[PDB]
Amino acid sequence: KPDPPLGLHMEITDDGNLKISWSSPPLVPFPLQYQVKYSENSTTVIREADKIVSATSLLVDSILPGSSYEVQVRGKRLDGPGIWSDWSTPRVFTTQDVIYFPPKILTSVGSNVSFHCIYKKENKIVPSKEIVWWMNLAEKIPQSQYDVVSDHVSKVTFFNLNETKPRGKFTYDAVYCCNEHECHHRYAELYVIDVNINISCETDGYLTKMTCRWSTSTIQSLAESTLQLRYHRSSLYCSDIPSIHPISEPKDCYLQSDGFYECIFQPIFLLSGYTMWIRINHSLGSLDSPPTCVLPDSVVKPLPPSSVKAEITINIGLLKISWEKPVFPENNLQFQIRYGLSGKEVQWKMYEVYDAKSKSVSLPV
Amino acid sequence: DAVYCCNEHECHHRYAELYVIDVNINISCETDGYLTKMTCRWSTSTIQSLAESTLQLRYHRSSLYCSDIPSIHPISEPKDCYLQSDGFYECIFQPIF
Amino acid sequence: VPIQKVQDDTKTLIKTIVTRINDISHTQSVSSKQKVTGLDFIPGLHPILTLSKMDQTLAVYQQILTSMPSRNVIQISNDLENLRDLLHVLAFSKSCHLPWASGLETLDSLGGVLEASGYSTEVVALSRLQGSLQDMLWQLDLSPGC
């Protein structure tokens, strides 16, 4: 005899279906079959329905506004002469007027999102022609956006979304579904966050570690957001098109005085393609910033050339400049030489040397 | 410095260790303006080269005056010195004789 | 995958490791070619004619460098891994199948030298690595074969 299913929860799907969900008891090492009993008690119709399901969830089509749903589930072993569990504790869910499906949308800039609504007026479902939509109670949405999907339900379609600008604490735009002039209290939440986060890396002058940095300035608008850099290491080189990989590991980043997070990769694999992105784990959903692949050997910030010597050649009268090529990188290098009269402000003349095997240059002065 | 003993051209892995440390450490003291305590200072700059070294100031108090030739005394006591922001250790003798 | 770019990068990684060793002042004063008894397991200058030989040489060096606590040395070991990977892609562009070299099975002896004399192991390993890399760099234009 299994224990009754636990954690019975009820959420509304993006389709406007009532999704009943529960957790399997943690102690059964075998699949369970469930029987779901639910009743729908409206002011005008009582419906009872018994459904048997092998999944840990049930969809109930078209939630009725101003109705109360009572649900019970019991489990039995799927294979063999199993005994039914006792029923779960009854859970009552009494709905409120006006339906949004979905209740919330978490998206990125440039995407398309659409909402659907049903408006219940005095135990009656109004026609879709009557329904009008509003944003943040400030202004009516243009009629061109509305589409009549069905007689009961109206829909708004948004295109080329722009970032939601925060008003005080609130990061999101409140979308309202109203019966003509008069609106209702409940609204739908639309969250648009700039995911365009630049991750730049720099390998130290000894090439012993790689430090990567990224700014918080676009994300200081969302309280409760947590930020986690994730990375995937390739065996060799970076792909032509970087992409999110299902198997990724987090990296410890530390906020610096300059407002940037600093993450040190040590040891570093110079010729392994490190694909990185920021994971934004909102209370409802996870977003990955556009992935970029970085090769540590190709992002080296070299040390300055050492043993720089500038001498004017006797008899010849050329400014002969010499140096020692800097330790890193050992790749062929192009060099840039700035020179000018020494003073409070130096008028730098620029000169570029593209010979890899060049260690000294003579420039007329 | 690793000192090696070799059979002609060919050497062996093991070597002898020779440690030479500048012991010329200047200890300067200063009695506060009310002459209630004496603060002594010395720099770490010569000794920052040896990890695992621990440094302890020791002192021996005479009954009267300083000797013409100072010397290490077998009976000595340590003094608590505290590293300051300027990189110097500061040891306060209070009360002072 | 550009073959020429990979070849140049292979050259670069070799020069890179050589220069790193050049930065290490104590290693510079030590003769690369010179033989030291006990260190013989370290792959020093002995003709490295082929890619498989290069791969096994780099593998042994990686294994030795990994064990020594030094910040520079860990990176050098990493560089050696990348060099091995570069050699593997070159062997692929040449239609060669390079088996992934394991390090030396015979590390049960290396512990003794690391404990008794860390300095000898480090200076020898670095100087011989620099020498081996230099001949490898010389030979990489000679049309290396598998």
Curated annotation (Swiss-Prot), chain B:
Locate the region Leptin-binding: 60-77
| Tissue and organ expression note | Isoform A is expressed in fetal liver and in hematopoietic tissues and choroid plexus. In adults highest expression in heart, liver, small intestine, prostate and ovary. Low level in lung and kidney. Isoform B is highly expressed in hypothalamus, but also in skeletal muscle. Detected in fundic and antral epithelial cells of the gastric mucosa. Isoform B and isoform A are expressed by NK cells (at protein level).
Q: What disulfide bonds does the UniProt entry report for this chain?
A: C6-C11, C29-C40, C81-C91
What is the recorded function of this protein according to its Swiss-Prot or TrEMBL entry? Receptor for hormone LEP/leptin. On ligand binding, mediates LEP central and peripheral effects through the activation of different signaling pathways such as JAK2/STAT3 and MAPK cascade/FOS. In the hypothalamus, LEP acts as an appetite-regulating factor that induces a decrease in food intake and an increase in energy consumption by inducing anorexinogenic factors and suppressing orexigenic neuropeptides, also regulates bone mass and secretion of hypothalamo-pituitary-adrenal hormones.
Fill in the domain comment: The cytoplasmic domain may be essential for intracellular signal transduction by activation of JAK tyrosine kinase and STATs.
Self-association state and partner proteins as the record states: Present as a mixture of monomers and dimers. The phosphorylated receptor binds a number of SH2 domain-containing proteins such as JAK2, STAT3, PTPN11, and SOCS3. Interaction with SOCS3 inhibits JAK/STAT signaling and MAPK cascade.
Q: Which disease is it linked to?
A: Leptin receptor deficiency: A rare disease characterized by normal levels of serum leptin, hyperphagia and severe obesity from an early age. Additional features include alterations in immune function, and delayed puberty due to hypogonadotropic hypogonadism.
Q: What is this protein called?
A: Leptin receptor
Q: Which organism is it from?
A: Homo sapiens
Please state the gene responsible for encoding this protein: LEPR
UniProtKB/Swiss-Prot annotation, chain C:
Please give the record's induction comment.
Answer: Induced by secretin.
Q: Does the keyword Disulfide bond apply?
A: yes
State the UniProt keywords alphabetically. Diabetes mellitus, Disease variant, Disulfide bond, Obesity, Secreted, Signal
Biological-process GO terms, alphabetical = activation of protein kinase C activity; adipose tissue development; adult feeding behavior; angiogenesis; aorta development; bile acid metabolic process; bone growth; bone mineralization involved in bone maturation
Record-level Gene Ontology MF annotations: DNA binding; hormone activity; leptin receptor binding; peptide hormone receptor binding
Intrachain disulfide bonds:
C96-C146
Compartment(s) of residence:
Secreted
Q: Which Pfam families match?
A: Leptin
Q: In which tissues is it expressed?
A: Adipose tissue is the main source of leptin. It is also produced by other peripheral tissues such as the skeletal muscle. Expressed by intercalated and striated tracts of submandibular and parotid salivary gland intralobular ducts. Detected by fundic epithelium of the gastric mucosa. Secreted into blood and gastric juice.
Chief localization class?
secreted
Protein family per UniProt: Belongs to the leptin family.
- Subunit structure as annotated in this protein's UniProt entry: Interacts with SIGLEC6.
The disease tied to this protein in UniProt is:
Leptin deficiency: A rare disease characterized by low levels of serum leptin, severe hyperphagia and intractable obesity from an early age.
User: Briefly, what is this protein's role?
Assistant: Key player in the regulation of energy balance and body weight control. Once released into the circulation, has central and peripheral effects by binding LEPR, found in many tissues, which results in the activation of several major signaling pathways. In the hypothalamus, acts as an appetite-regulating factor that induces a decrease in food intake and an increase in energy consumption by inducing anorexinogenic factors and suppressing orexigenic neuropeptides, also regulates bone mass and secretion of hypothalamo-pituitary-adrenal hormones.
Name under which the protein is recorded: Leptin
